[PDB]
Design a binder for this molecule. Structure first.
Ligand SMILES: Nc1ncnc2c1ncn2[C@@H]1O[C@H](COP(=O)(O)OP(=O)(O)OP(O)(O)=S)[C@@H](O)[C@H]1O
Ligand SMILES: Nc1ncnc2c1ncn2[C@@H]1O[C@H](COP(=O)(O)OP(=O)(O)OP(O)(O)=S)[C@@H](O)[C@H]1O
Ligand SMILES: Nc1ncnc2c1ncn2[C@@H]1O[C@H](COP(=O)(O)OP(=O)(O)OP(O)(O)=S)[C@@H](O)[C@H]1O
Ligand SMILES: [Mg+2]
Ligand SMILES: [Mg+2]
Ligand SMILES: [Mg+2]
Ligand SMILES: [Tl+]
Ligand SMILES: [Tl+]
Ligand SMILES: [Tl+]
Ligand SMILES: [Tl+]
Ligand SMILES: [Tl+]
Ligand SMILES: [Tl+]
Ligand SMILES: [Tl+]
Ligand SMILES: [Tl+]
Ligand SMILES: [Tl+]
Ligand SMILES: [Tl+]
Lengths: 524, 524, 524
């Protein structure tokens, strides 16, 4: 394929032009005074949304070089979403502000490599300063406050989360599913969650969540890599019988057997999912047999001689419900006797004392907490059906925020956290003049999130940002009420984790983009 | 796919241009002095119609951005149709008037978010003012008056509706079907109606009721989500013996199970209809069993161990007819024993009296109201079939209006109801100047429906609207006779429900469209 | 000639586009942080200047309609210059801000005639409020302060003005000419100044002032309108003998006599100029004899029997310098007599002893105030013809500032005077909503001069204007030092007259331009 190549200044202006389209399409949806962005669909009515992720996903430009620019900063928005779930628009407004001001310096005739190091040092210092500004959420009374304001002043939502975290702990696994009737239910059932995602994106069946949800799915467990589907068939054929989906945990299922499972599921023939096993090597083999007893199935490995050809349904585990993130797989209520699991539990409790090491201890406790710790199931209750399904997603986006509120804490919202960090790093310097500007680029980029919220509110961003900088602490601007004051007292707050993710990722890409000299793409 | 993105003022003018096409094509058919709109078809003769829905459906513009605008306000027209069945043209004329005047303010330099809140507050106040202006229809003598004038001064139509409502009640289920002979018949047969419509559009046979219609159909009842059709087959091709259509009521009907049922009804090879089971969860199973008894069939569940691959024709329920709208499904004549149905009467009669929880008593009544409350059936008769048809249609074209006349009442027609509300909300104010204009935009939009009817009548709208505002009460303009007077006395009236729907929906979309800053569509 | 005609919105956007070119070309030169504008000349080097008048004069657009717009606001800049000599840029920045915001309202759908009345009422109130904010200059100590700061902190300049005003008075006539040597000289010589302009703008020899100037000149005086040169030859033929310029003061100079003298001075064959006879009718005939006695010549009129043919050298009058503005003739050091002037005065003062009417008195008083009041003359003195020309240049301009400082006073500079008036008229209302916006347009236009100065200074105008509004009084922003403080104490001040002229004129044109619906121009 014939290629087009652009160099230097010529190449960069095409990126800036490209990112500016994606940014300006997203930055308009920032804050509560945000604007609607309409996205066209071929089938019927257009989609009107404020969700910065949905808008970002749709952007793809005509000019191949511009497209690259745009597609580069898009990779950040989506990754910020993967880290926290929040702050995708806040990431993108930052990224733009670093790139626009960054490239200005490069064009002025400054060393890009010194500019990158200036930005990254300013960021590493900003993350460090941010941890100091963070107000932790320890007790289950302050945890309830975060879940309430995140779900639009709903006290019923925050009460459930606090009760769920009081059962499984702060490290425990909490999941939300559809309710049975009129009252919110809460049970702790035997389940497990491990840190591996879906094997391919086309496994999804949730129109919005980007998730794979399977009701009463049988579980196949394979220690060996599956290349050909020629081995899976005898199992797969018995899973079509008694039409219930299939979950494949293995070392790997990649190459041929994956694509044939993608062709099938999407065509409609049997709902299936594939997921890489947790961990690696010797500690994997154990974890898998842990799932196996908990899910009531049996492991199949080439090591003893058990091949998938001769694999009936007892080898297959049963679970009540499974959910698969982009980066996580989780199970709810597997079959497996009270004893059967708690028996395997003690078989790891012995291993705590028998093996004398530093690292070997951790893995055993991170296994027993997944397995004997349990899983929290909150079933939402309302009167009419559409009042339940609306109260469902409300809890889900009020949980993700609470999760981040526990791990790193909550900083002052309204983009004031960053603008407060900015004034506290004014004395920060690099090694040479070029690095010094690199810092000032990053510090002037931290003002942009606030400035963008004010712009949507109709007020002059310059005036408001200047007033917030003059006052000290958690004093900021409420765009909803057009009133100044203490942000924490006004319920305006952002989880520290989301703001840390938004800044770090946005700097990471800008750093790579500032050091760009050559672009190679396909010919129009 | 490469995308085109437009921002701000540039993006909005394409919407306005787009909505103006759909609006101007529809607003010409308003009132009785309305004009004909001709719609082209590839096969043979063009369709000449005044129906604002039929005209709206056909509009789809070339310019992708314009198309979006047009397709946005179309959603409303169709949704107003879903709420009432009337006032689709009245909705669209309103929507245009809010958008055109709204965007004018945005372009002047006013906050869209404040303009939206100004409109919505003016609307919430207008709905509240509308309820006060409403004249209720309580007794069955005033109910007969509404059915008479809605069917073009036909007294035979209004008499049947009043007799039907005197049998099953105001909450009762009333259905119209083809007559047997020369006299109008009225029986109450064992049937039920639940708040679930067709699961896919492609089930529609005749697009007049906008519904599925099945003669002598079997019914299947199962409390499970249908994965694959490799479960249905032994039943589907069992109903094909003796040759009759089938009804499918399952938790859901998704995936391959859905699409292959679609392909089989469409191509003719046995006609089936997929509808959800009503309510949810625990009273999902309960409300479904009610139907099983009513139909003389059986239930196939998840807990017990009953699968589809062993249900004979005996295991199926049966009916004389089923009517399936978008949000509705109603059954007629259940082959179930006269005692077995009455046995479930006692099985709910024991539940009401023995209820510790205060909520059950409410919905248990809403179970016997659909079971022992009944279903009324009117068979319209004449000497010629060409007047059996024409008279059959005249009853349904009077029932939908009577339904709304009972639920919320009837206001003064001629678009005077809204113009009367307009003068009564002149003192309404918001929080800032921008919100204040948002209200005045909505109030000047309420004048448009009347103004549009007068425009079709050839008279100057400005003069007539000014005369109607000067006088008070139910004093309006009769466009048919070119005479002023009391609207109620002249038989010109609109169901409160339709006018409330027309205003609310039209404001809802305008609100979303005013807050639009970015549009993303496919490249030409 | 074939014409092009544009109507309404189409016609207005061409004006706005047109004024925006002239405004943006001038507004960049506002304040002391102003930018340079380069003007091209066909002959040699381009002219680099900051003078808002020189820039305005040069603007003339290609698009005939755009040109009209631009040429309309240009008429104001030049007229502000005619009133004060200062504030031409400040006028233009105001005019733009009223037009831009004005037309926005017209396009929104508001009555132009109500918008004009709203602006004019806001202005009449602003001029009234401005008189209250003015700090008068009464004593000759505070008069010296104004002449010092206007001439770039030069105390020698301010000392001369104060000494000149102590001789002839505040109403007295003061003129500046070239010096003889090394010290500044000050004499009071027998002269007079009256209020008429030149008949041709092509008589102007020194364009920098925009004025006519003749050394040791001859003078004609005639109570008759001159139309033919056949009456003029034997006069003009005598002028080349004794090589010196000529000044005609006749009733009027018409058609031929005009076009003769205008072109026949371009050639360089006899420099001349012609101005209208001061006053009218009866008071016309005397004022001329005054001049004749003042100069030492004689008058010539058809009334008595005096023809223009036998007008010799002695019938002509002699001064030592005559200066003519757009609207200001001034005869300096007329070689009359001791006994003739003292005689004519003691005669005119006897007329007021026999004063019959209140008014007849006044115009007689004002007539000796001219004749017996004399003219003060200042001969600037410095080393070489480089600092002599420069000092004279700072004097002329500062005198002009001191003149206005006496008549109306001095307000607080930095454009704060207007922005202070703006906050004090916030409660001002009109008769209807459209008039109310007309006022708010004018009040937001008063902020622009300050905002434009800050823009040139590089600082954000929004931030600075917001800070000036918060504080009260003569507290403003110094753009030269980037410091806030009391403007009067910092020497930053504007003569009230100039700010009054700048506002009134800018509103006058904007008012006319807002009420424009049709434009007629020549075809391209
Ligand atoms: N009342 C408020 N006033 C000012 N800022 C607010 C207010 N409420 C929330 N915010 C800020 O809103 C910002 C978040 O904007 P969002 O619209 O959530 O975009 P995002 O989080 O970047 O991405 P999405 O769209 O959530 S996936 C947070 O940083 C809050 O500080
Ligand atoms: N004689 C009349 N004079 C004035 N208005 C009338 C008269 N008769 C009916 N109307 C008004 O006609 C309006 C309804 O217009 P329609 O043409 O029915 O449009 P629509 O109801 O919005 O949608 P369709 O076309 O019925 S689906 C009602 O609001 C009546 O108030
Ligand atoms: N140090 C200063 N800081 C801020 N404003 C100043 C300062 N010095 C002068 N000004 C303002 O400068 C404004 C005048 O700008 P100029 O450049 O003189 O334009 P103008 O007077 O409109 O027209 P010209 O160019 O003089 S004919 C006055 O209103 C002063 O208030
Ligand atoms: Mg967010
Ligand atoms: Mg209708
Ligand atoms: Mg000046
Ligand atoms: Tl957003
Ligand atoms: Tl299972
Ligand atoms: Tl606002
Ligand atoms: Tl219609
Ligand atoms: Tl049947
Ligand atoms: Tl008519
Ligand atoms: Tl200037
Ligand atoms: Tl004063
Ligand atoms: Tl002379
Ligand atoms: Tl500066």
């Amino acid at each position: 394929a014939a290629k087009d190549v652009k160099f230097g200044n010529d190449a960069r202006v095409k990126m800036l032009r490209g990112v500016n389209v994606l940014a300006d399409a997203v930055k308009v949806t920032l804050g509560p005074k945000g604007r609607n962005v309409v996205l066209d669909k071929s089938f019927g009515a257009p989609t009107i949304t404020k969700d910065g992720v949905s808008v970002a996903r749709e952007i793809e430009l005509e000019d191949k070089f511009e497209n690259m620019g745009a597609q580069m900063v898009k990779e950040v928005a989506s990754k910020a979403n993967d880290a926290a779930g929040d702050g995708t628009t806040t990431a993108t407004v930052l990224a733009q502000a670093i790139i626009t001001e960054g490239l200005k310096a490069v064009a002025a005739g400054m060393n890009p490599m010194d500019l990158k190091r200036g930005i990254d040092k300013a960021v590493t210092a900003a993350v460090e300063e941010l941890k100091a500004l963070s107000v932790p959420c320890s007790d289950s009374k302050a945890i309830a406050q975060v879940g309430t304001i995140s779900a639009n002043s709903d006290e019923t939502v925050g009460k459930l989360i606090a009760e769920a975290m009081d059962k499984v702990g702060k490290e425990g696994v909490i999941t939300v599913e559809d309710g049975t009737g009129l009252q919110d239910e809460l049970d702790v059932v035997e389940g497990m969650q491990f840190d591996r995602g879906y094997l391919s994106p086309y496994f999804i069946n949730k129109p919005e969540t980007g998730a794979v949800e399977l009701e009463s799915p049988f579980i196949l467990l394979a220690d060996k890599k599956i290349s050909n589907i020629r081995e899976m068939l005898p199992v797969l054929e018995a899973v079509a019988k008694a039409g219930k989906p299939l979950l494949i945990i293995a070392e790997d299922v990649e190459g041929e057997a994956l694509a044939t499972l993608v062709v099938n599921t999407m065509r409609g023939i049997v709902k299936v999912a594939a997921v890489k096993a947790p961990g690696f090597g010797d500690r994997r083999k154990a974890m898998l047999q842990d799932i196996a007893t908990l899910t009531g199935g049996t492991v199949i490995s080439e090591e003893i001689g058990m091949e998938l050809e001769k694999a009936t349904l007892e080898d297959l585990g049963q679970a009540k419900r499974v959910v698969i993130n982009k980066d996580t797989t989780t199970i709810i209520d597997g079959v497996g006797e009270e004893a059967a699991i708690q028996g395997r539990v003690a078989q790891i409790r012995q291993q705590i004392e028998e093996a004398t090491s530093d690292y070997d201890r951790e893995k055993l406790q991170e296994r027993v907490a997944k397995l004997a710790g349990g899983v929290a199931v909150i079933k939402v209750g309302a009167a009419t059906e559409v009042e339940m399904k609306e109260k469902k997603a409300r809890v889900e986006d009020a949980l993700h925020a609470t999760r981040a509120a526990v791990e790193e804490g909550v900083v002052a919202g309204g983009g004031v956290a960053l603008i407060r960090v900015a004034s506290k790093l004014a004395d920060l310097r690099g090694q040479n003049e070029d690095q010094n500007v690199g810092i000032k680029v990053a510090l002037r980029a931290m003002e942009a999130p606030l400035r963008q919220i004010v712009l949507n509110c109709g007020e002059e961003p310059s005036v408001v940002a200047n007033t917030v900088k003059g006052g000290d602490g958690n004093y900021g601007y409420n765009a909803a009420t057009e009133e100044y004051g203490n942000m924490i007292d006004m319920g305006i707050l952002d989880p520290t984790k989301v703001t840390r993710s938004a800044l770090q990722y946005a700097a990471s890409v800008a750093g790579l983009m500032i050091t760009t000299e050559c672009m190679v793409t396909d010919l129009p």
